[PDB]
Design an enzyme around this catalytic site. Structure first.
Site, PDB file in Angstrom:
ATOM      1  N   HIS A 164       0.812  -1.211   0.000  1.00  0.00           N
ATOM      2  CA  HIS A 164       0.000   0.000   0.000  1.00  0.00           C
ATOM      3  C   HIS A 164       0.847   1.264   0.000  1.00  0.00           C
ATOM      4  CE1 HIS A 164      -3.678  -2.293   1.844  1.00  0.00           C
ATOM      5  NE2 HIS A 164      -3.350  -2.711   0.635  1.00  0.00           N
TER       6      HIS A 164
ATOM      7  N   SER B 217      -0.942  -0.416  -6.189  1.00  0.00           N
ATOM      8  CA  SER B 217      -0.883  -1.677  -6.906  1.00  0.00           C
ATOM      9  C   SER B 217      -0.579  -1.433  -8.377  1.00  0.00           C
ATOM     10  CB  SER B 217      -2.201  -2.445  -6.768  1.00  0.00           C
ATOM     11  OG  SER B 217      -2.125  -3.697  -7.425  1.00  0.00           O
TER      12      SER B 217
ATOM     13  N   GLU C 151       4.430 -33.977  -2.336  1.00  0.00           N
ATOM     14  CA  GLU C 151       3.216 -33.456  -2.937  1.00  0.00           C
ATOM     15  C   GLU C 151       3.545 -32.700  -4.219  1.00  0.00           C
ATOM     16  OE1 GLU C 151       0.058 -33.640  -2.654  1.00  0.00           O
ATOM     17  OE2 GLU C 151      -0.215 -34.760  -0.791  1.00  0.00           O
TER      18      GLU C 151
ATOM     19  N   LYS D 247     -15.634  -7.824  -6.547  1.00  0.00           N
ATOM     20  CA  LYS D 247     -14.845  -8.642  -7.465  1.00  0.00           C
ATOM     21  C   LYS D 247     -14.075  -9.731  -6.722  1.00  0.00           C
ATOM     22  CE  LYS D 247     -12.035  -8.239 -11.614  1.00  0.00           C
ATOM     23  NZ  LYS D 247     -11.434  -7.289 -12.590  1.00  0.00           N
ATOM     24  N   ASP D 248     -13.490  -9.400  -5.568  1.00  0.00           N
ATOM     25  CA  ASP D 248     -12.801 -10.410  -4.777  1.00  0.00           C
ATOM     26  C   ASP D 248     -13.774 -11.410  -4.165  1.00  0.00           C
ATOM     27  OD1 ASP D 248     -10.696  -8.838  -5.495  1.00  0.00           O
ATOM     28  OD2 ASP D 248      -9.996  -8.422  -3.458  1.00  0.00           O
TER      29      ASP D 248
HETATM   30  C1  HEM Z   1       0.752 -16.406   1.951  1.00  0.00           C
HETATM   31  C2  HEM Z   1       1.334 -15.805   0.909  1.00  0.00           C
HETATM   32  C3  HEM Z   1       0.851 -14.480   0.268  1.00  0.00           C
HETATM   33  C4  HEM Z   1      -0.202 -13.704   0.578  1.00  0.00           C
HETATM   34  C5  HEM Z   1      -1.264 -13.905   1.682  1.00  0.00           C
HETATM   35  C6  HEM Z   1      -0.206 -12.579  -0.330  1.00  0.00           C
HETATM   36  C7  HEM Z   1      -1.122 -11.553  -0.345  1.00  0.00           C
HETATM   37  C8  HEM Z   1      -1.155 -10.531  -1.264  1.00  0.00           C
HETATM   38  C9  HEM Z   1      -2.254  -9.619  -1.483  1.00  0.00           C
HETATM   39  C10 HEM Z   1      -3.593  -9.628  -0.719  1.00  0.00           C
HETATM   40  C11 HEM Z   1      -1.908  -8.775  -2.456  1.00  0.00           C
HETATM   41  C12 HEM Z   1      -2.786  -7.633  -3.009  1.00  0.00           C
HETATM   42  C13 HEM Z   1      -3.768  -8.200  -4.025  1.00  0.00           C
HETATM   43  C14 HEM Z   1      -3.059  -8.398  -5.336  1.00  0.00           C
HETATM   44  O1  HEM Z   1      -2.165  -7.579  -5.659  1.00  0.00           O
HETATM   45  O2  HEM Z   1      -3.390  -9.365  -6.063  1.00  0.00           O
HETATM   46  C15 HEM Z   1      -0.570  -9.119  -2.892  1.00  0.00           C
HETATM   47  C16 HEM Z   1       0.156  -8.491  -3.879  1.00  0.00           C
HETATM   48  C17 HEM Z   1       1.437  -8.817  -4.266  1.00  0.00           C
HETATM   49  N1  HEM Z   1       2.138  -9.941  -3.882  1.00  0.00           N
HETATM   50 FE1  HEM Z   1       1.574 -11.265  -2.426  1.00  0.00          FE
HETATM   51  N2  HEM Z   1       0.869 -12.704  -1.182  1.00  0.00           N
HETATM   52  C18 HEM Z   1       1.540 -13.858  -0.844  1.00  0.00           C
HETATM   53  C19 HEM Z   1       2.671 -14.338  -1.464  1.00  0.00           C
HETATM   54  C20 HEM Z   1       3.420 -13.665  -2.401  1.00  0.00           C
HETATM   55  C21 HEM Z   1       4.515 -14.216  -3.171  1.00  0.00           C
HETATM   56  C22 HEM Z   1       4.989 -15.681  -3.046  1.00  0.00           C
HETATM   57  C23 HEM Z   1       4.980 -13.247  -3.978  1.00  0.00           C
HETATM   58  C24 HEM Z   1       6.141 -13.272  -5.001  1.00  0.00           C
HETATM   59  C25 HEM Z   1       7.047 -14.250  -5.092  1.00  0.00           C
HETATM   60  C26 HEM Z   1       4.199 -12.057  -3.724  1.00  0.00           C
HETATM   61  C27 HEM Z   1       4.364 -10.841  -4.343  1.00  0.00           C
HETATM   62  C28 HEM Z   1       3.378  -9.894  -4.483  1.00  0.00           C
HETATM   63  C29 HEM Z   1       3.446  -8.687  -5.277  1.00  0.00           C
HETATM   64  C30 HEM Z   1       4.652  -8.229  -6.121  1.00  0.00           C
HETATM   65  C31 HEM Z   1       2.286  -8.043  -5.143  1.00  0.00           C
HETATM   66  C32 HEM Z   1       1.895  -6.713  -5.810  1.00  0.00           C
HETATM   67  C33 HEM Z   1       1.439  -7.013  -7.230  1.00  0.00           C
HETATM   68  C34 HEM Z   1       0.733  -5.821  -7.809  1.00  0.00           C
HETATM   69  O3  HEM Z   1       0.313  -4.934  -7.027  1.00  0.00           O
HETATM   70  O4  HEM Z   1       0.593  -5.762  -9.055  1.00  0.00           O
HETATM   71  N3  HEM Z   1       3.256 -12.347  -2.763  1.00  0.00           N
HETATM   72  N4  HEM Z   1      -0.144 -10.197  -2.141  1.00  0.00           N
END
Ligand code: HEM
Ligand code: HEM
Lengths: 101, 60, 51, 54, 379, 80, 51
Positions: E201, E205, E271, E227-228
C-alpha cells in the site's frame, strides 16, 4: 536498412500499445529518471500523456481495443519524452561522475 | 399499474430492516425447500441403492 | 444522562422504535433459523415438516 | 463394494453434499456475477472526454 | 463532527486498507489471487484448528487419530479434506500469484517482492511439515528424504539434520516437533502477510498495462470487494469440487498405510507443489549441488528485479518476453511432471534439460530478449 | 421578504401566472406551511430523497469526489 | 554498479577496511564462543582447559 525498418515496424505492430492509442514514451517504466523527465514536460504534452494513459487504462478495463483507424501509426509515433529523459540521464551521469572523484 | 418488482421494492426492499427480514424469512423457507428438492433428486438418482430404500426388507 | 431526557429524544425514539423492532425481528428469526430451535419452528407451517 | 464403503464411509453423504453444493453454486455464481456487473456498469459504461481549452 | 470510519484508529487502518484504498481500475482477474491467498490462509487456519482438536502428535496415535477424524468426528472428513485440498489450492494460487508478478513486472516493488519470497518459503515449509502429520507411508518417507537432503551441507550437515530430527532419524520426536512448528508457522505467515500489505500500500498496486494508474484510480470497496468476493466464490467452487467429488485426486494412496520404517513404498515423491523443485534436485547428480540448485530455484525470485533490463515494466507490450514467459511456464509444468515420474532413461535427460532451460530462461534469455526488444523500439 | 419591492412582486405575479396559472396569496402559502409537520417532512423526504439515484456535477480538483457507486450507497442508510 | 568505481570509492574502502576487519573478527569470535567450536578453542590457552 529497410530490413531493420521492416522488423522494427513489425515489432511495433506486435507490441500492441498502439492498439490502445498509446505512444512509445507512454509505456516506459516510471523510475526516478522518468519521473523527473515527466516533471519537466510542458503542460500540453503532460495533459496529452495523461489523457492517453487514462484512455488506455479504460480500454484495458473493458478488455477492448481502439478502432483500427485510431491506432497510433508507427511513422507518426513521436518520442516526446526522449529529449527530456536524455537530459535527465545526462545530468545524473554528470553527478555520478563527479561523485566518483 | 405497478409491476410485481415495484411492489417488492416498495413493501420489502425500500427499508433495510424490512429487507433483512425478507432475507431471514426467505432463508428459512429456502433451506427447507432446497434440501427437500435436493434430497429428492439424489434419492431418485440412487433409487433402490440406499438403506432407506432397502431397510423395509430387513427392518422388523 | 439527563442530557437525553428531553422532548426531542422522546420524538427521536418514536421515529426509530419501528426500525428497532424490525431489526429485533430479524435477530429473532435469524436465531431461530440458525439454531433450529424447534420450540418455535414447530408452529411454522411448512418448516415443521422437518423434525 | 464393501471395501469401498470401509475406506470411504462418507461416500454417499459426500456425493449428496456435492450435489447440494453444485446446485447452490450454479445458483450463486450467476447471482454474484450479476451483482458485480451491476456495481461495475458505472465504470464499464463510462465515457471519457478530453477538452483542452487550447 | 467527523466520520468514525476515517477517524477511529482501527477504522482508519481498515478504511485505508480495504475501503478507500485507491486501486487501479484495470487490474484483471489475475489480481484476485492475492486476496484468494489470504482467504486460503484463513481457511487453513480455521480448518486446521478444528483438526487440532482431534489430532494427537504421537506416532502410536497419529494415524489412528486421523482415521478417527475421518470416520467418527461429525463432518470430520469434510474438515480433513478441506485442509488437504486447501493446501493444494493455496499452492495453485501462490504459483499463479508469482507468475502474475513475473509477467506484469510487479517485482519492481522490491520490499513487497522480497516479503512475498519469504512468504513463499514459509508456506512451503508449513505445508511440508504438515504433510508429515498424518504419519502415513508417504509422510514418513518423504520427510526422511527431504530432511536427509540437509545432510549434504558440508561440516555441519549431520549435526544439523540430527538436531532437526530430534534423534537419529524421523521418529516421534520429529513428528511432535513438526506438529508444533506446523501449528505456529501460519500465524507468522499472517504477520508477514500484514507486513506485505503494508509494503504494498506504500506504492499502490500495479496494473496489466504496467503504466502508473494514478490518473485512473477508483475506490477499492464498491468494485474490488465484490470482485474479490466473486473470485473467492469461484475458488470455493473449485475447492468444493475437489473436496466432494475427488477428495483423493491430489493425494497419493500410499499415504493411507501406517508408516513402516522397515519398508519403503513402491514410489517416493512429495506433494505435487514440490515436484518441480524435486525434479531440479534430481537433475544434479551431486548431493550438495542438487541441494544448492533446489535452493536457487526459489531464491532466483530475489534476483528477478535485478535482471529487469527492459524499458517497459509489464510484458503486455513485449511479445518476445511473453514467449519466454510461457516457455518458462511450460518448463515448470514439465519439471512437475518429471518430478512425479521415476528416475529412468528418458526422464533423467528430460529433467536435466528442463532444469537447464529454467535457469537459462530466467537468467540469460530473458534479459537479452528484453535488450533486443528495447533496441527494436529504438529506446 | 422576497416580495418586498415592485419588481419582485411583478416577477412573482408573472412567474406564478406562467407556472401555477394563478397568483398564490401569502395567506395560502402560510396555510400550506402550517400544514407541514415532522411526519410530513419525513414522508416527503423519503419519497424524494431516500434511496434515489442522484445527478452529480463536479468541476475542478474533484479527485476526492466519491465515486458514483459510493454516492448512491450514501443515498440510503443500512441502519434504517 | 559502475557508479561506485572511482578513486573516492577506493578511498572509502581503504577507510572502512579496518572497521570491516574488526567487525569480522567480532563475528568470528562470537561464533566460536557461541558454538564452542573446540576446533579453534583447543588453541586458546586458558579456554582449552575446559573439556
Ligand atoms: C501467503 C502468501 C501471500 C499472501 C497472503 C499474499 C497476499 C497478497 C495480497 C492480498 C496482495 C494484493 C492483491 C493483489 O495484488 O493481487 C498481494 C500483492 C502482491 N504480492 Fe503477495 N501474497 C503472498 C505471497 C506472495 C509471493 C509468493 C509473492 C512473489 C514471489 C508475492 C508478491 C506480491 C506482489 C509483487 C504483489 C503486488 C502485485 C501488484 O500490485 O501488481 N506475494 N499479495
Ligand atoms: C498456510 C497454512 C497451512 C497449510 C499450507 C497447511 C497444510 C497442511 C497439509 C498439506 C496437511 C496434510 C493433510 C493430509 O495429508 O491429510 C496438513 C495437516 C494438518 N494441519 Fe495444516 N496447514 C496449514 C495451517 C494449519 C494450522 C493453522 C493448523 C492448526 C491450528 C493446522 C493443523 C493441521 C493438522 C492437525 C493436520 C493433521 C490433520 C490431518 O492430517 O488430517 N494446519 N496441513
Amino acid at each position: 536498412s529497410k530490413w531493420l525498418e521492416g522488423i522494427r515496424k513489425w515489432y511495433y505492430n506486435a507490441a500492441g500499445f498502439n492498439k490502445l492509442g498509446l505512444m512509445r514514451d507512454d509505456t516506459i517504466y516510471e523510475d526516478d529518471d522518468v519521473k523527473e523527465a515527466i516533471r519537466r514536460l510542458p503542460e500540453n504534452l503532460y495533459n496529452d500523456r495523461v489523457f492517453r494513459i487514462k484512455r488506455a487504462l479504460d480500454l484495458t478495463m473493458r478488455q477492448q481495443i481502439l478502432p483500427k483507424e485510431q491506432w497510433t501509426k508507427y511513422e507518426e509515433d513521436k518520442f516526446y519524452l526522449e529529449p527530456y529523459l536524455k537530459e535527465v540521464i545526462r545530468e545524473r551521469k554528470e553527478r555520478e561522475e563527479w561523485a566518483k572523484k | 399499474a405497478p409491476t410485481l418488482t415495484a411492489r417488492l421494492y416498495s413493501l420489502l426492499f425500500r427499508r433495510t430492516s424490512t429487507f433483512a427480514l425478507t432475507i431471514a424469512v426467505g432463508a428459512l423457507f429456502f433451506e427447507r425447500a432446497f434440501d427437500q428438492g435436493a434430497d429428492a433428486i439424489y434419492e431418485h438418482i440412487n433409487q433402490g441403492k440406499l438403506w432407506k430404500h432397502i431397510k423395509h426388507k430387513y427392518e422388523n | 444522562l439527563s442530557r437525553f431526557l428531553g422532548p426531542r429524544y422522546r420524538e427521536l425514539a418514536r421515529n426509530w422504535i419501528p426500525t428497532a423492532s424490525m431489526w429485533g425481528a430479524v435477530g429473532a428469526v435469524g436465531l431461530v433459523w440458525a439454531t433450529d430451535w424447534r420450540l418455535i419452528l414447530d408452529w411454522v407451517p411448512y418448516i415443521n415438516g422437518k423434525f | 463394494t464393501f471395501l469401498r464403503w470401509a475406506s470411504e464411509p462418507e461416500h454417499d453423504h459426500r456425493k449428496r453434499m456435492g450435489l447440494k453444493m453444485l446446485m447452490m453454486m450454479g445458483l450463486l455464481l450467476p447471482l454474484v456475477y450479476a451483482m458485480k456487473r451491476h456495481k461495475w456498469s458505472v465504470l464499464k459504461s463510462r465515457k471519457l472526454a478530453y477538452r483542452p481549452p487550447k | 463532527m467527523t466520520n468514525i470510519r476515517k477517524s477511529h484508529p482501527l477504522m482508519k487502518i481498515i478504511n485505508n486498507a480495504f475501503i478507500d484504498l485507491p486501486a487501479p481500475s484495470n487490474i484483471s482477474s489475475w489480481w484476485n489471487f492475492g486476496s484468494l491467498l489470504g482467504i486460503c490462509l484463513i481457511l487453513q487456519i480455521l480448518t486446521g484448528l478444528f483438526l487440532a482438536m482431534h489430532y494427537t502428535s504421537d506416532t502410536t496415535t497419529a494415524f489412528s487419530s486421523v482415521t478417527h477424524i475421518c470416520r467418527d468426528v461429525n463432518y470430520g472428513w469434510v474438515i480433513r479434506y478441506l485442509h488437504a485440498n486447501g493446501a493444494s489450492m493455496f499452492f495453485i494460487c501462490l504459483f499463479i500469484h508469482v507468475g502474475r508478478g513475473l509477467y506484469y513486472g510487479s517485482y519492481m516493488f522490491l520490499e513487497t517482492w522480497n516479503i512475498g519470497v519469504v512468504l513463499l518459503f514459509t508456506v512451503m515449509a508449513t505445508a511440508f511439515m504438515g504433510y508429515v502429520l498424518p504419519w502415513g507411508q508417504m509422510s514418513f518417507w518423504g520427510a526422511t528424504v527431504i530432511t536427509n537432503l540437509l545432510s549434504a551441507i558440508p561440516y555441519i550437515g549431520t549435526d544439523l539434520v540430527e538436531w532437526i530430527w530430534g534423534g537419529f532419524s524421523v521418529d516421534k520426536a520429529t513428528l511432535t516437533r513438526f506438529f508444533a512448528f506446523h501449528f505456529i508457522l501460519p500465524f507468522i505467515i499472517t504477520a508477514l502477510a500484514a507486513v506485505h500489505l503494508l509494503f504494498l500500500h506504500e506504492t499502490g498496486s500495479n496494473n496489466p498495462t504496467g503504466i502508473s494508474s494514478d490518473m485512473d484510480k477508483i475506490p477499492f470497496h464498491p468494485y474490488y470487494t465484490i470482485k474479490d468476493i466473486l473470485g473467492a466464490l469461484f475458488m470455493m467452487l473449485i475447492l468444493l469440487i475437489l473436496v466432494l467429488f475427488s477428495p483423493d485426486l491430489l493425494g497419493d494412496p500410499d499415504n493411507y498405510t501406517p508408516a513402516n520404517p522397515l519398508n519403503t513404498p513402491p514410489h517416493i515423491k512429495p506433494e505435487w507443489y514440490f515436484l518441480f523443485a524435486y525434479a531440479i534436485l534430481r537433475s544434479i547428480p551431486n548431493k550438495l549441488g542438487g541441494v544448492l540448485a533446489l535452493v536457487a530455484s526459489i531464491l532466483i525470485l530475489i534476483l528477478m528485479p535485478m535482471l529487469h533490463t527492459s524499458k517497459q515494466r509489464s510484458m503486455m507490450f513485449r511479445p518476445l518476453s511473453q514467449c519466454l514467459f510461457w516457455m518458462l511456464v511450460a518448463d515448470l509444468i514439465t519439471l512437475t511432471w518429471i518430478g512425479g515420474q521415476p528416475v529412468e532413461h528418458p526422464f533423467i535427460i528430460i529433467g536435466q534439460l528442463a532444469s537447464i532451460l529454467y535457469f537459462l530462461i530466467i537468467l540469460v534469455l530473458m534479459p537479452i530478449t528484453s535488450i533486443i526488444e528495447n533496441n527494436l523500439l529504438k529506446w | 421578504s422576497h416580495l418586498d419591492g415592485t419588481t419582485p412582486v411583478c416577477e412573482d405575479i408573472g412567474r406564478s401566472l406562467l407556472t401555477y396559472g394563478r397568483r398564490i396569496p401569502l395567506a395560502e402559502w402560510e396555510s400550506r406551511i402550517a400544514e407541514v409537520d415532522a411526519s410530513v417532512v419525513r414522508e416527503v423526504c423519503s419519497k424524494y430523497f431516500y434511496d434515489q439515484c442522484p445527478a452529480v456535477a463536479g468541476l475542478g480538483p474533484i479527485e476526492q469526489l466519491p465515486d458514483y457507486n459510493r454516492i448512491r450507497s450514501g443515498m440510503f442508510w443500512l441502519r434504517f
